[PDB]
Amino acid sequence: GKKSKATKKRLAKLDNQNSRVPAWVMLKTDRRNHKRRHWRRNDTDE
Amino acid sequence: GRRIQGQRRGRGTSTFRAPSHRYKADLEHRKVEDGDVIAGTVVDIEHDPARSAPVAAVEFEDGDRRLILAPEGVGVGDELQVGVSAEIAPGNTLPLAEIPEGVPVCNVESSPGDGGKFARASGVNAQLLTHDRNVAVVKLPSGEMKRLDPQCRATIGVVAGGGRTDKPFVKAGNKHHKMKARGTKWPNVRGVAMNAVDHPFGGGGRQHPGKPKSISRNAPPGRKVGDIASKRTGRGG
Amino acid sequence: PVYVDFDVPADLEDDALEALEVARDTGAVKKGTNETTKSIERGSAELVFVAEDVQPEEIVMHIPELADEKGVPFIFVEQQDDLGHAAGLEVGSAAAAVTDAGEADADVEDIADKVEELR
Amino acid sequence: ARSAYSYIRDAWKNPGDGQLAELQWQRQQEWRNEGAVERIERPTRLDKARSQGYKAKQGVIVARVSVRKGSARKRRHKAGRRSKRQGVTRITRRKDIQRVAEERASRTFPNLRVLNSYSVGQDGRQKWHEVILIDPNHPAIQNDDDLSWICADDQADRVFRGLTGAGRRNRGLSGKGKGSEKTRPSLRSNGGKG
RNA sequence: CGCACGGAGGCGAAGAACCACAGAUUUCCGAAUGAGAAUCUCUAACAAUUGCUUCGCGCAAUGAGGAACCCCGAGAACUGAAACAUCUCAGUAUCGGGAGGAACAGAAAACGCAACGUGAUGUCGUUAGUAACCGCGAGUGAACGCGAUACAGCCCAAAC
RNA sequence: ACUCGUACGGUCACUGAAUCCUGCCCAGUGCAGGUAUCUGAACACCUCGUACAAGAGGACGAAGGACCUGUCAACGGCGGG
RNA sequence: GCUUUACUGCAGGCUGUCGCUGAGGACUCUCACUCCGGGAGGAGGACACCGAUAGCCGGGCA
Ligand SMILES: [Cl-]
Ligand SMILES: [Cl-]
Ligand SMILES: [Cl-]
Ligand SMILES: [K+]
Ligand SMILES: [Mg+2]
Ligand SMILES: [Mg+2]
Ligand SMILES: [Mg+2]
Ligand SMILES: [Mg+2]
Ligand SMILES: [Mg+2]
Ligand SMILES: [Mg+2]
Ligand SMILES: [Mg+2]
Ligand SMILES: [Mg+2]
Ligand SMILES: [Mg+2]
Ligand SMILES: [Mg+2]
Ligand SMILES: [Mg+2]
Ligand SMILES: [Mg+2]
Ligand SMILES: [Mg+2]
Ligand SMILES: [Mg+2]
Ligand SMILES: [Mg+2]
Ligand SMILES: [Mg+2]
Ligand SMILES: [Mg+2]
Ligand SMILES: [Mg+2]
Ligand SMILES: [Mg+2]
Ligand code: NA
Ligand code: NA
Ligand code: NA
Ligand code: NA
Ligand code: NA
Ligand code: NA
Ligand code: NA
Ligand code: NA
Ligand code: NA
Ligand code: NA
Ligand code: NA
Ligand SMILES: [Sr+2]
Ligand SMILES: [Sr+2]
Ligand SMILES: [Sr+2]
Ligand SMILES: [Sr+2]
Ligand SMILES: [Sr+2]
Ligand SMILES: [Sr+2]
Ligand SMILES: [Sr+2]
Ligand SMILES: [Sr+2]
Ligand SMILES: [Sr+2]
Ligand SMILES: [Sr+2]
């Protein structure tokens, strides 16, 4: 498929949202990413 | 029940339409101011997809290039004329008044200036019978005597391609190819071969129409099938 | 047009309008269909003017017959704006009336007489 | 004495007699070739226009609107319906043609508000009405003591809500007594039985 | 120095944090309005429809949103009638259009406890399941008046 | 829509290549045509009625029907004695 | 769901009548209206179309 500049920006965001809750947040909050998406197992929009 | 095939037709969907975009020209009589002064040279002969018959490409003196409904015997190089004082030769177009009686004509106008309506299919022709100051009587290909305005233009000769109907299609494939060039759904499933829900003649444990086939003229669409307002049927008597 | 039954010559109209101007600067005039209509009814109208380019025609239709059953003479003017300018208005006027002329009594009388001859 | 206006009024009491008859036969020919909504410089019926609130002033507009004659243009049922609800032919709409005319006009002039309207005849297949519209934004009207009431925010789209005279008439609000039980203060408040 | 108690660091007596009011900034799509497009792009823009008009987009208006309420239009069926068609469910559900902070209504061509009487309009209580409707079946169903609430009365067209 | 189409067309149906063939029946039903006479609604018209109206009757009479004819490669039928 | 000479209706077709609609039991005309024609202009014409109502047919549909 051919992605437009906008489609590419969204896909990019989706990938970065796929990051982990930084180590420090665990310590600060004294103790989970509910949006962990997998390329295969899951399915994005558009 | 469900709407019958005749009803789906009227919706004008793709399946029922004619491949217009593949059609060449709306062969109409060239418009002339008056005086008749107008002639052209036959530049080529082409096949008309819409009528399964030949059509002449004609280039006029004023530079206009238009396809024409060609009569039989017209060839490249020939000079055709159109107007009140045109020469009484095959291929020329002039009002019924200037056309001598007893002469075969084609592509006759119904109302002067409409561009031609009657006798346009392969090989057919209308016979110009009577003259008058008010009306010119013509015998159309169906055998009907048609009283017309003598100002109605018409072309001399029989339409080219005569005898097309003489050779049988022989096989379905040939019909298929012709049908694909017309605004028609084909093949044809017999009503009597359908389910009651699909057609008035459908149903039964064996194939036969429900009631008699001759249907009243007043019958509504969805029911008007079979022999529409037949004055009689069969061959005997 | 539906209320107009006779054509008034350009020259005759010139005479009529000229008389109207002197009529406003000497005697008295009424401008506008309403005022003109009242004059014909009250009897104070000596000569009434009616424009031919009135749209809608309803506005004036009644004049030609009201003036008749009141013995008041009338004349048709081609343009609404000319009648209004003659009456001394920046705007046009569908109808005007000379209520007691002034130094135009001779002209008006003749004009009235000329119209009778013109049917 | 009689007003010149009274003569236009009297003529229109019988649009089929006299000069008016000839006039209508002539105009209608031009009207039939005109559009749906046609703005016109002057009202065909001055007496009526003025009587309805019209004024030769900036911000006052008039337009002739033609609507088709007859009952409702209804599509027959495409699903189960008891015999009572199977009709098509004899069904008529609840708004009158004059009211349809007013709305079609108001839509043509999004910024103007309908003041009133009146009939100007009909041929065999359509009716014509002239609608008087008002520019609630022109200072010529915002300062007019007689018309500035239409400039109020609550008068916005007054025609679409039936606040027009023809609207109120059609809503069955003419009578203040007997017969207006289900109409006043509103059809909707009375369960839609008016 | 947000939720959020970390690490590094920083800010605050030049009165920070924090709160109230006012103001600045305020990407792209979006009624979406220069034109096109799945939030981007192409080469000056009130696009479109209108009013006024210096007739030039010069000055203006409309569009779309909002929990329901409100007003104007379109308008079912299951169901009930122990079946069912009128009737009923119901002018309900749903659909189209539109306003406001409330809408709508409203100063009698009224009422008609018939009078020597009442006196704009909504609404609440009542009148009353009364009158009236109805395969006179099932069902349906007001008003005048009265007691209250709140009270307010005016402007044109024409005559001149 | 058919249709840039015009009876050698295109619509609506039946039968289902070729070959040899395709009888009899129009009473019923369908379709179509005709029709002296009969029947046939509303408006308008006339009489009665009502100071008006409701209403009753009359006159005229369209398509349709009666009646007549055509038609079965229309629906169908082709027996008892 | 389907059928039909089941009950009751609703579209649709045919037909009369009123409106559009005009001039001089049959007829002429042109000006509305319709169509043809680029147009000039031609054909048609108070009919047709459309709006309204009445009778008939009407499992096409509910
Ligand atoms: Cl073929
Ligand atoms: Cl409005
Ligand atoms: Cl009282
Ligand atoms: K029901
Ligand atoms: Mg990564
Ligand atoms: Mg052609
Ligand atoms: Mg064949
Ligand atoms: Mg095809
Ligand atoms: Mg077949
Ligand atoms: Mg089968
Ligand atoms: Mg089966
Ligand atoms: Mg069927
Ligand atoms: Mg078989
Ligand atoms: Mg068979
Ligand atoms: Mg309310
Ligand atoms: Mg854009
Ligand atoms: Mg039940
Ligand atoms: Mg019962
Ligand atoms: Mg009820
Ligand atoms: Mg009461
Ligand atoms: Mg087979
Ligand atoms: Mg045309
Ligand atoms: Mg059924
Ligand atoms: Na995936
Ligand atoms: Na508006
Ligand atoms: Na009601
Ligand atoms: Na902001
Ligand atoms: Na704007
Ligand atoms: Na401008
Ligand atoms: Na039950
Ligand atoms: Na049941
Ligand atoms: Na009932
Ligand atoms: Na038979
Ligand atoms: Na079923
Ligand atoms: Sr998968
Ligand atoms: Sr053609
Ligand atoms: Sr042509
Ligand atoms: Sr069958
Ligand atoms: Sr035979
Ligand atoms: Sr002027
Ligand atoms: Sr609005
Ligand atoms: Sr009070
Ligand atoms: Sr065979
Ligand atoms: Sr028969």
Swiss-Prot record, chain A:
InterPro entries: Ribosomal_eL39 (IPR000077), Ribosomal_eL39_CS (IPR020083), Ribosomal_eL39_dom_sf (IPR023626). It comes from the Archaea. Keywords: Ribonucleoprotein, Ribosomal protein, RNA-binding, rRNA-binding. One of its GO terms (biological process) is translation. One of its GO terms (molecular function) is structural constituent of ribosome. One of its GO terms (cellular component) is ribonucleoprotein complex. The keyword RNA-binding applies. The keyword rRNA-binding applies. Binds to the 23S rRNA. Forms part of the polypeptide exit tunnel. Belongs to the eukaryotic ribosomal protein eL39 family. Part of the 50S ribosomal subunit. Interacts weakly with protein L23. This is Large ribosomal subunit protein eL39.
From Swiss-Prot, chain B:
The keyword Transit peptide does not apply. One of its GO terms (biological process) is cytoplasmic translation. One of its GO terms (cellular component) is cytosolic large ribosomal subunit. Coiled coil: none annotated. Residues 199-237 are annotated as: Disordered. Changing residue 199 to A/G: No incorporation into translating E.coli polysomes; ribosomes assemble normally. Significantly reduced translational activity. One of its GO terms (molecular function) is structural constituent of ribosome. Keywords: Ribonucleoprotein, Ribosomal protein, RNA-binding, rRNA-binding. One of the primary rRNA binding proteins. Required for association of the 30S and 50S subunits to form the 70S ribosome, for tRNA binding and peptide bond formation. It has been suggested to have peptidyltransferase activity; this is somewhat controversial. Makes several contacts with the 16S rRNA in the 70S ribosome. PANTHER family: LARGE RIBOSOMAL SUBUNIT PROTEIN UL2, RIBOSOMAL PROTEIN L2. Part of the 50S ribosomal subunit. Forms a bridge to the 30S subunit in the 70S ribosome. Interacts weakly with protein L37Ae. This protein can be partially incorporated into E.coli polysomes in vivo, indicating it can replace the endogenous protein. Belongs to the universal ribosomal protein uL2 family. This is Large ribosomal subunit protein uL2.
From Swiss-Prot, chain C:
It is found in: Cytoplasm. Keywords: Cytoplasm, Ribonucleoprotein, Ribosomal protein, RNA-binding, rRNA-binding, tRNA processing. Transmembrane segments: none annotated. SUPFAM superfamilies: L30e-like. PROSITE patterns: RIBOSOMAL_L7AE (PS01082). One of its GO terms (molecular function) is structural constituent of ribosome. InterPro entries: eL8/uL1-like, Ribosomal_eL30-like_sf, Ribosomal_eL8-like_CS, Ribosomal_eL8/eL30/eS12/Gad45, Ribosomal_eL8/Nhp2, Ribosomal_eL8_arc. GO terms for biological process: ribosome biogenesis; translation; tRNA 5'-leader removal. It holds the Pfam family Ribosomal_L7Ae. GO terms for cellular component: cytoplasm; ribonucleoprotein complex; ribosome. Gene3D superfamilies: 3.30.1330.30. Part of the 50S ribosomal subunit. Interacts with protein L15e. Probably part of the RNase P complex. Multifunctional RNA-binding protein that recognizes the K-turn motif in ribosomal RNA, the RNA component of RNase P, box H/ACA, box C/D and box C'/D' sRNAs. NCBIfam families: eL8_ribo (TIGR03677). HAMAP family: Ribosomal_eL8. Belongs to the eukaryotic ribosomal protein eL8 family. This is Large ribosomal subunit protein eL8. The lineage of its organism: Archaea, Methanobacteriati, Methanobacteriota, Stenosarchaea group, Halobacteria. The gene is rpl7ae.
UniProtKB/Swiss-Prot annotation, chain D:
Transmembrane segments: none annotated. Pfam families: Ribosomal_L15e. One of its GO terms (cellular component) is cytosolic large ribosomal subunit. GO terms for molecular function: rRNA binding; structural constituent of ribosome. Disulfide bonds: none annotated. Residues 71-92, 162-194 are annotated as: Disordered. One of its GO terms (biological process) is cytoplasmic translation. InterPro entries: Rbsml_eL15_core_dom_sf (IPR024794), Ribosomal_eL15 (IPR000439), Ribosomal_eL15_arc (IPR020926), Ribosomal_eL15_CS (IPR020925), Ribosomal_uL23/eL15/eS24_sf (IPR012678). Keywords: Ribonucleoprotein, Ribosomal protein, RNA-binding, rRNA-binding. Part of the 50S ribosomal subunit. Interacts with protein L7Ae and weakly with L44e. Belongs to the eukaryotic ribosomal protein eL15 family. This is Large ribosomal subunit protein eL15.
